Amino acid sequence: ASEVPQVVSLDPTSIPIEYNTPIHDIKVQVYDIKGGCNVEEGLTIFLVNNPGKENGPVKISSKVNDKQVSEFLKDENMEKFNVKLGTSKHFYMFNDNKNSVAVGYVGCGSVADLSEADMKRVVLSLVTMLHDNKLSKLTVVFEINVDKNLFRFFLETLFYEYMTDERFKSTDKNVEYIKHLGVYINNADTYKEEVEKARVYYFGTYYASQLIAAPSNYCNPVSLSNAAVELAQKLNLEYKILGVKELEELKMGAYLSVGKGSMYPNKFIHLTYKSKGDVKKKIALVGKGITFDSGGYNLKAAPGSMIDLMKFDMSGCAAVLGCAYCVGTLKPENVEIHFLSAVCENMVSKNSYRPGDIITASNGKTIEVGNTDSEGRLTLADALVYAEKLGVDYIVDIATLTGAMLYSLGTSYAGVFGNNEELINKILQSSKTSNEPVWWLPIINEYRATLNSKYADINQISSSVKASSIVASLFLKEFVQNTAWAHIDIAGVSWNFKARKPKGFGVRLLTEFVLND
Amino acid sequence: SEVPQVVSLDPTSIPIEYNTPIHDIKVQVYDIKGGCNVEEGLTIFLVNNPGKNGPVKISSKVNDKQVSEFLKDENMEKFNVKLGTSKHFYMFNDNKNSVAVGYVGCGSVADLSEADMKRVVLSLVTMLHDNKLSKLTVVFEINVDKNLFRFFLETLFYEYMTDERFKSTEYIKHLGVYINNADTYKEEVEKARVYYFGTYYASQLIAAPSNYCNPVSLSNAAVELAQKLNLEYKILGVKELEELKMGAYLSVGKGSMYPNKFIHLTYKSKGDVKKKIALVGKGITFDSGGYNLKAAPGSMIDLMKFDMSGCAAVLGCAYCVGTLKPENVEIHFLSAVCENMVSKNSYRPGDIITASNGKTIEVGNTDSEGRLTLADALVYAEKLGVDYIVDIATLTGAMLYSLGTSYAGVFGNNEELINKILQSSKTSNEPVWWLPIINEYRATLNSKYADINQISSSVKASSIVASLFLKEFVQNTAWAHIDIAGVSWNFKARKPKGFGVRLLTEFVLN
Amino acid sequence: SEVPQVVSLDPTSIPIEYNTPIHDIKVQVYDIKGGCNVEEGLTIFLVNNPGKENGPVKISSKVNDKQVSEFLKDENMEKFNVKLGTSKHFYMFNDNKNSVAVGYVGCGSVADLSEADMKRVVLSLVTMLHDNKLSKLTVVFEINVDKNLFRFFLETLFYEYMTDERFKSTDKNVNMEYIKHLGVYINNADTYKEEVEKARVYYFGTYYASQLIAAPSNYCNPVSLSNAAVELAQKLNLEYKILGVKELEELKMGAYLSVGKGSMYPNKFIHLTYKSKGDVKKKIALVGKGITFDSGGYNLKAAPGSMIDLMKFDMSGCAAVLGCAYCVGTLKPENVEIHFLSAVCENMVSKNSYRPGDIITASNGKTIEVGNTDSEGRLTLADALVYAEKLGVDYIVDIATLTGAMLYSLGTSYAGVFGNNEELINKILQSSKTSNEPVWWLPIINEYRATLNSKYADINQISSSVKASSIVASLFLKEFVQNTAWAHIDIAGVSWNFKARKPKGFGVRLLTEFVLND
């Protein structure tokens, strides 16, 4: 751990991380539907659909072990409510023991097979009923048909949206969290091995979200690397933080040039998880770690640049650290995973690197900088050369690289590039089981000639092709010569603009990829 | 039928070259095992070197001593095989006649990509534009399959041809080819000549400016082309697009001095019909952007004569299908042609219009007029009761930021049809990539007053949002959507590509 | 106290002219009923013609010279009208065979001259003073003005007459000579006499603030500006206190210190105090925005229209507060205690600068999510308002060149005032009337408050949903005044005289009249 430099004594010297969230205190109990439901204290919610009939009537098909509540939930009373996706209603009644209970439902539409987006819409309605109410238990009854991955996704998303980050509130606050969660589902014994898997995947996403949402005066190269050391110490992971003196010896000129104009020294994070049984799989995960992207002398001054959001330019690093928690907790075997990130800050200063400067990567390649705001591929280039030297089988990088993703895939799907069938297909398969959507995009070799520099070995940016995401992959491909490599561009999907919060995108996708090899 | 004019000097028809000098070239393919003979003309070797860029080495028992000593390995070490380099020299043969010999480097990747093979053709054509010879012979010292060989011939013919219809102030007559299994490539020769003109014909329509190529003159050429090919044809006028209530399509052309014209060509095969296909192309002869005028930097208003490339690709496909005459297929070539102008009669941003299927649309941007014309075209296409609907359009400039200028994007609601398009992209060597229709963005097309919004005001993924809009007008048929806004125009050479003609034709034939 | 330098040629102090040529002018006011003696220099008549749109000129004062009375006869003035701003020069010899200069300045046909009208009248008078080498100017008031307007005439005459040449070297005006005497003939002269030395005090307070604003940011920095304020307090004998970075750290002024993080000049907080002899019945804290240069930070002023070259004036509010400190310290009002406050710093681009998105903690514990580094004025004032409320005052008045949106609402003439208390606003408007510095009342719309709700911090610095930045900024400042009556004057549009290429010194007379009438 290094000392965080400060301009004034009021500058923060560490990122606040919440490890023991109220989600961790929720006792989760799952029961089988073929045994009846017991309407207890708190709120009991039914997940109901109606296949074929758009906005069809509500019909409860589960045995309720209460004569009074069964009379309330009869077909001749559900009738006036429909199953439109996202609709919710509250019921108040008295049970057989003359006790007042609260019951309700959330409509799951028709369609029968709900997408990840549709399930989020259902979960958001569920959270609205959990909000502004002081319940001690919530019970969810699954009268919709879901597989194991979608059931785990339901719990992960519910935990994540229910959780509220108040680390930076002072004068502001309000009300409490439920202490128990009940789940009724057919074949319940098969679904509940996913419960504690969902709790692990939740915190990894929330931990990544905590690091992303942390501003750049809190989350800087020094404090971000310190948090990775702190996380590795709790999970007993091997760790090494590379300082400038070691990065100078490794000749990481591309990575070092980006951080020249920062008051925080560059810090390269290298975490390692090793298995007990002999290792038959070696994987290196690389994340872009720019704690703040001012753009450099190519300053983000255009209206659409969204510079006030550029604290999220380390979303790739947070996704890898979130994976380090999930992998470090569940402990898969026969794998070595290397969690890497070249962390720095891209600022404007007398010491900053200039547009037009020619820099040398750690593999000997010289690069002519055409735009200082394209610093991601420069830091990733040195990180990929470092990653390949570790002798791994797969290299997967994740980065908020290009704003062009907002104009290609948008805010819902991330893009994956690569040089190999199966690493892309294994990543695409992991997107299916993790329910984090990713789309395969091409590396068009015709654009490679536009990176031909007149003086340096290669140009950092193209001079003609406006497809920045594809050109960046072509540039990064030049720094992986022999290893299977894939690249995930999450620049469009990392931040939830409507909810004004991070998504923690990549944690579950990367973890599922490690666990399925 | 009659093109309106403002002044008497305004043109009233698109000029088209039907008989190009390429059609006069007799092509002959021989097997390389018998050796090469350089009697007359210019002979060019296509050379590679797995392990380069290193020197070229000619492998041929060329039966002329003067050129054979010149082509010796000791004399070709001073030239390299870098992708694109070329050197050609002229000298005397055994009969004391002047001949020219040279090479084109093909790199070290053994299998040339579509872009790599193109670059080889450009180097070969460069020497052809500085040539006054009567015969050219090409020797393939590289490995090419049957589809890439045809692609080589098409690109050679198309890049060699020069469009001089609008200029006011030569070609070889024989083409020789030496390659293994000349019998297998022989059948590919005349397919390339047909694929060439369909591409060149579409380029002629695209390159034709908007004062020459307008809704009336473009539909007149489609009829004239249909008569020479003998396809069924009907052109729908305004007075009866109004009867079909094509309000989205008719609103776009309101501000134009040219009446809207709907092109409908039909091909029917001799064998039994096992596939009914409708090909729809965006046909905006000029896109001013409407009252959302293309005034921002990057709008490229001077190139907006190319906004009918999808229609031109559909018309070019009608040539290839009408000439090669495939069977067991019935194809409808459709395009709703109009002009998007600024006028007192133009439609306004915010106007609510009604498509031919009853859906009300709130116009959010008049430059997004392409999806409005395609909406009514898809309702018309689905009413035909066809099995596949494939539309191709220069829809959104965001494609320049997604796939760029090389790869086109395809969206659709049917996995099987998408695979046919991707498989046809492989054999046609016109690259296309599959992009998703993410239903998550559909909610942003919810209009406060109309049935559906024309554009999304929040999601900046215009290519995906526009595909979501078109999907709302296809109820039951397998449908795919090819966006060629990024690939249609070749900005470096300042000329069209004719992109999509061979892609659609290969899809029909396979 | 020591100004840091990059090179040895960087200035280490703001040059200030204390003894201006105006202070050497002997001013004497005479009664118009006794007649005017024209003798030497230039004699100017302020003439009107009610009802007649630019009607003929009529000199209506008894002149004690037969020759000059014959020249000023009605039959000789066919050709000059009273059009507002029109002026004419006359040459003649008086009864003593001495050459004299006489003229007039047209004051229109509206018996009551507005503040803008009187400024146009004074500007015409100064044009006759320039390019001429006179030793006395004499003004004859043939128009009706109250005691406030007569004083306003003198202040504007003094202010426009003076020429600031501190930064000329090879281009000083060689033909620049100031008059040494000023005679004024006015109806009921004894009632206006007391306004003369009040006008001279009001002149320098306005001119002192103009000197500080016109000084560029390489001369006027946080250190040299606070050093000048100390020098001013010592000349006036006021209590003074300059708070350094270490004291501001202990007061937890995180918003103020975050703005100046990227500067080579340390933050300097000005705290001057004037206390009364006798019992005090009003405690007032005057807060002025003191941004010596506003580059905008990482939200750099790069868009067209931002006028990054004029941002040396972003400390105009501080200058207006210090200019009032001179007026209060000189006229010495009592039954009042005044605090002159300013959180002075520089908003720069550096590796140490604060970033968009950073969350900072104010001195009252509230966390703020920064949305735009160019909105730094409201950040420094927030800590200054919390500091002011701890002083236990009755009124808190802040003055700041806060939002460029003021240009599109009120323009370049009227300043905008916001507040949480009605009587304070009414007192500000009353001071605006008597000081003749126009101010208009604008609302603090509480419906916009919801757009300042931050997802992580206690409050957002900016809205970025509501485009009414002048109102939104007042919502923000209101969050840091809990119980005291507070008003806020936005002078971003009125501080700089774009046409005249010089500051206005706006606020000095307005604040002093507010202090003098409570």
Ligand SMILES: [Zn+2]
């Ligand atoms: Zn960047």
Ligand SMILES: [Zn+2]
């Ligand atoms: Zn970046």
Ligand SMILES: [Zn+2]
């Ligand atoms: Zn358009």
Ligand SMILES: [Zn+2]
């Ligand atoms: Zn268009």
Ligand SMILES: [Zn+2]
């Ligand atoms: Zn500012």
Ligand SMILES: [Zn+2]
């Ligand atoms: Zn400012």
